[PDB]
C-alpha cells in the first residue's frame, strides 16, 4: 500500500498517510489517531492510480463525430476513443480508409490504426473497381471452357 | 473573493454564439455568471478578457476563419465587438491542418454586460478543454 | 485608480513606430501617458503588456512580417525589445490573406520608460479597433 | 511582494520539457521557484499563466508543431495539460518559415504544483529572449 | 415610445423610464418627479436606435484606401463604406475588376458588389482587347462593301 | 563628457550629473558634494555607450548552430554573430551556399553575406560538376597536341 507524507494542519506533526486506490480520492487526510479516508469518485470523474488527490479528475476525453468509445468513462479510468469503422487514426485525425483504384487490389484492409494497403494486380489477376475491400481476382480461363476474344489486363477481366 | 471565469469548449454547440462548459474540468466561475453562451458581469469595472479557439480540418479549403469576442446589453439593440481575429490563406489546399486564434486585452465593463464568443465555421472548431477556452478576471 | 491603457490602431500611421488612438472608441488611458506612438510609464513597477496586430493583403507574396514591442528611455541611447514575433511562409502565393500576431507578458518597468510597437510592413496592417491594439496594466 | 515569473528561452535544452533562463536578461522570478524546466508554486491561489514559443526552419516540411503548458505534482502520477496549441499545414513546402504559438489563461493552482512547457520539435525552436518565454503571476 | 426599467439610485424605487431617440443618449435617468433627459450625440459618435446608453457610440468604421464613404458619420448612424469605382467587395477586400481577355467580351461590367462578367465571343463577333469594358462587336461585313482576305476569329476582326 | 539631469532623492535639488562610460554603469548618482560613481560591468553584461543606466545590459545575442562569434561578449559590447564558413545570411537564417550545376561555373564564391554566383559556361569552357567552388575551365586543345573525337560542351570536356 503506497503512502505519502503529510503535516497535521492541527499540530504540524510529520505523518505517513496511506494513499487512496483507483476509483477514490482523499476526502480527509490521516491524523495521529486515524488513517486516510478515501471517498468514491463522483459521476464523470476518475482516478486511475493510487493517489492523494483531494478531488477526482474529470473525464475530459470526448469522442468526436468520426470516433467511438473504446472505453467508457468510469471511476477507475478516463474515456478513450478510437476511429469508427471505415476510418483510421493519423496525426490526431480520423481519416477515411483509402480505395484501391482499378488495376490495384486490397492486400490488407483498413483498421483503426492503419490505412488500406494496395498492390498492383499481379499477372493473371485483375481488379476493375475503386474499392477499399475488393481484392485482385484471377482472370477467367476462357480456354478452360470459348477461346479468348481479349486477354485480361490488371484492370479488366479476360473477354470471351 | 476575486471575480473570475475560465470556461472550456463545449462540443454541443449547434449554434452561435458558442456555449461553454462552466462546471467540469479545469474551469472557474466566481462572481460572474454563465448564461446561454454568455459571461454576465455583475460588478462594473476593469477586466482582462481572453479567448482561444482551436480550429482544424482533414482537408484544407481555406474557408475564412473568424473569431470574435463581443458584448451585448439591454441599453442598445446591437452588439459591440471588443476583439477579433480573422485567418485567410492559412493552409495548403487539401492537407490536414490546424491553427488557433488567441485574443486578450483589458476592457471597462458594466454590470449586466453579457460577453460572448462567435466563430465563422463552427464545424472546424475543436473543443478540447486545453485548446479552446474563454475567460476573464477583474483587475 | 488603476494604471491602465488600451489603445487601438491608428490608420494615419505614416511611419514607425505605429501611432495609436487614445481618445475615441473602446480605449482606456489612466495614469499612463500617450506621446507620439508611445506609452509613457509614470510609476515604476510590474506591468502586463500586450499587443495585437492584424495583417492582411489581396495577393500574398510572403513578405516577412515582424511585430515588436520595445522600450526606450533617456538612460541609454538604444532600444530594448521586450517581445517580438515574426511570420514567414504564412500564405499561399497570390491569394487573399490575413493573420494576426499576439504578444503579452509581464515586465518590470521604470518611471519615464516609453513603450512602442513596431512592424515590418506598415502597408499590410489593418487598423480596426477590435483587430489591432496595444495596452498594459499595472499589476 | 508579488508572486511573479517571466523566464526566457534557454538554448541548452537537449530534452523535454524545455528549460528556461531564470537569472539573466529581461526575466523575473519572485515568490515562485524554478527547478529543472519547472515553475514551482508555493502559495495556493489564482494565477494567470502564459507562454510563447517561436518556431522557425530553413525548409518547411510541415512537421506538426505542438506547444503545451502542463502541471505535475506528487498527488497523482500523471500530468495535467492546462493549455495547448497545435499547428499543421502552416507553411509552403520547401520555404524558409517562422511562426509563434501564444498561450495564456487563468488557473487555480496549489502549493507544490510544478508547471512546465513541452513542444513537439525541439529543433525548430528559437530561443531568443523576446521570442520565446514562459511566465505567470498571482492575481 | 419605448421604455426601460430603472431603480432610483436615491430611493431604490422601481421606475419606468422613457428611452432616448436615435441621435441622443441618456444624460440623466428619470426619477419620480422628472422624465429621462436625453442629450445630443457629440461629434464623431452616434446612436442609431432608441437606447438607454449613457454615452454615444464612436463612429468606428473607417474607409481604407480602396474604399469611399457610402454614408457619413452622423449623430444617427455610423459611417459606411463601399469600394471606389473600379473595385468590388469580396471577403472583406476591395478587389480590382477583372479584364476580359482577347477572345472574350464583357456581358456585365463590374459594380461595387460584383466582378466583371465575360463571355467567349459568339460567332461573327470579336474582342481584340484585355478590357474590363469592351464588349464583343460584330465582324465587319467585307463582302457587304472588298472580298475577305481572312475570316474573323473571336479575337480578330475580319481582314479585307 | 556627457551629462544628465538628476533630482537629489535626499533634497529634490536639481543637479547635473556626469554619465558613465562604455563598460560601466551608474552605481551611485551624483549629489551636491560628489560626482556620479560608475561601476564596472559584471560578467555577461555590457554597456556600449555613455549611459546613466543603473545596471548593465545582458549579452543576449547567442550564436545558433550555423553561426560563429564575430565578436565576443565584452563589457563594452554585446556579442555578434555571423554565419560559419559554407553559409550565408538571408532573412535571419544561415543558408548553405549553392552549388553551380554541370554546365555552369562559379564566378564568385559564397561569403557570409552573399550566395555563390554562377554563370553558364562560355564557349570553349566547361564545368562537369555540381560544385560551390569549381570554375569554368577551358576545353583541352586536342588538335594542339590527337584530333578531336567529340567537341566539348559547356558540361563536358573535349574528348580525344
Ligand atoms: Mg481496385
Ligand atoms: Mg476582351
Ligand atoms: Mg558547375
Curated annotation (Swiss-Prot), chains A, E, F:
Q: In which tissues is it expressed?
A: Detected in fetal lung, brain and liver. Detected in adult stomach, spinal cord, lymph node, trachea, spleen, colon and lung. Highly expressed in several primary tumors from colon, stomach, rectum, esophagus and in SW480 colon carcinoma cells.
Per the record, the major location class is secreted
Could you tell me which cysteines form disulfide bridges? 17-30, 20-38, 41-56, 59-73, 63-81, 83-94, 100-118, 121-136, 142-160
Q: Where in the cell is it found?
A: Secreted
Name any Gene Ontology BP term: apoptotic process
Q: Name one GO cellular component term.
A: extracellular space
Alphabetical keyword list: Apoptosis, Disulfide bond, Glycoprotein, Receptor, Repeat, Secreted, Signal
Q: Which domain of life is it from?
A: Eukaryota
What one GO molecular function would you report for this record? signaling receptor activity
Q: Where are the TNFR-Cys repeats?
A: 1-38, 40-81, 83-118, 120-160
Q: Which residues are glycosylated?
A: 141
Q: What does this protein do?
A: Decoy receptor that can neutralize the cytotoxic ligands TNFS14/LIGHT, TNFSF15 and TNFSF6/FASL. Protects against apoptosis.
What is the designated name of this protein?
A: Tumor necrosis factor receptor superfamily member 6B
Q: Supply the source organism for this entry.
A: Homo sapiens (Human)
> Span of the full-length protein shown?
33 to 193 of 300
UniProtKB/Swiss-Prot annotation, chains B, C, D:
Q: Which residues lie on this side of the membrane: Extracellular?
A: 1-139
Report disulfide bridges, numbered on this chain. 60-91
Q: Please list the residue ranges annotated as the THD domain.
A: 3-139
| Residues the record marks as carrying a glycan | 42, 108, 118
Cellular localisation: Secreted
Q: What does this protein do?
A: Induces FAS-mediated activation of NF-kappa-B, initiating non-apoptotic signaling pathways. Can induce apoptosis but does not appear to be essential for this process.
UniProt name for this protein: Tumor necrosis factor ligand superfamily member 6, soluble form
Identify the segment of the full-length protein shown: 143 to 281 of 281
